[PDB]
Design a protein around this ligand. Structure first.
Ligand code: NI
Length: 341
């Protein structure tokens, strides 16, 4: 049954609640982004109204075959009326098409649902600046002070410099980047740009990237692997066995692989600077774990909430254990006492 933290009180609405069957009294299902834990349950047989971004609606139609008549895409940064209630979609700085949702309840309550997000000071100058928020439904993925990681820009600098060095030393090296969902496209696109290559991938992944409105995409990606020296593979295949196997397939065009696994946090983060990261190596194969996150660090999360000053916080992540829940509630109280709201 649908958990309370997926329901918007005072409305007919749910958020990211497609795996529960027909939810009683739900008149409109919102979807924040196209990640499987959130869309779980949608298919071509769904016949209720789904509200989402344009990019998310491209993916619903083309990848899951949801029929067009039930897809309701909304523009961002634009006041819209849905079943009698004003809503706004805001960029969540997550994966392509990911949104936060502002609901303006008929009784005067204002609710922000972050979906999945990476908080940024740029958010302090969106339509959030304009009014008070009573209830915050918060992506608390990394809600503990041990979770530190660098900016996306520092991580991409490291990856570009690493790839460019390796391939300039050895023009016969192949670069491989792991993927299992949309998101983190900057990693492989920035590497292919510095090398003057397109990124090669499977037809299924090419299809997915073509739904994303990325400018000049036809110039950057391809299904012709042989013409490319940056290849995308499933994240599961980014290991010595899986890579040795791929290298066989390229028919002696290449004699070395440099591979990237963009993880979020790993506890190498509590000890090592991005500058100091080193790969795991076996023979002519090296694998770098790089901490490219599309969720808030603890400090980014704290700064956002202390700026917003919500009356009540509802976590949407890490809610299954009492120890997690109690940890998170302690930090919420600290933040409120330090800031004074
Ligand atoms: Ni997500």
């Amino acid at each position: 049954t649908c958990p309370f933290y997926k329901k918007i009180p005072g409305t007919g609405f749910t958020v990211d609640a497609f795996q529960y069957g027909v939810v009683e009294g739900c008149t409109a299902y919102f979807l924040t982004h196209f990640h499987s834990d959130h869309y779980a349950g949608l298919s071509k047989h769904f016949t209720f109204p789904v509200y989402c971004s344009e990019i998310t609606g491209n993916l619903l139609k083309n990848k899951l075959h949801v029929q067009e008549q039930y897809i309701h895409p909304l523009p961002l940064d634009t006041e819209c009326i849905v079943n009698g209630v004003k809503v706004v979609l805001l960029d969540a700085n997550h994966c392509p098409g990911a949104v936060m949702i502002l609901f303006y309840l008929p009784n005067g309550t204002v609710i922000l649902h972050t979906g999945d997000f990476r908080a940024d000071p740029s958010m302090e100058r969106s339509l959030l600046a304009d009014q008070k928020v009573h209830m915050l439904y918060l992506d608390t993925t990394y809600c503990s002070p041990e979770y530190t990681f660098p900016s996306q820009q520092e991580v991409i600098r490291f990856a570009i410099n690493t790839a460019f060095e390796a391939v300039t030393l050895n023009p016969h090296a192949l670069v491989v980047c792991g993927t299992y969902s949309i998101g983190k496209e900057k990693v492989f696109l920035a590497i292919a740009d510095v090398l003057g290559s397109k990124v090669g991938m499977s037809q299924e992944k090419y299809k997915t990237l073509q739904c994303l409105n990325i400018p000049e995409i036809n110039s950057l990606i391809t299904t012709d692997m042989c013409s490319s020296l940056v290849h995308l593979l499933p994240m599961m295949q980014i290991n010595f066995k899986g890579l040795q196997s791929h290298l066989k397939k390229c028919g002696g065009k290449y004699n070395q692989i440099l591979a990237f696994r963009p993880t979020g946090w790993t506890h190498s983060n509590k000890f090592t600077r991005i500058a100091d990261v080193i790969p795991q190596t076996k023979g002519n194969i090296s694998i770098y774990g790089i901490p490219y996150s599309e969720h808030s660090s603890y400090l980014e999360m704290k700064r956002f909430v202390q700026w917003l000053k919500p009356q009540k916080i509802i976590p949407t992540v890490n809610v299954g254990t009492w120890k997690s829940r109690s940890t998170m509630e302690k930090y919420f109280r600290e933040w409120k006492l330090e800031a004074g709201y």
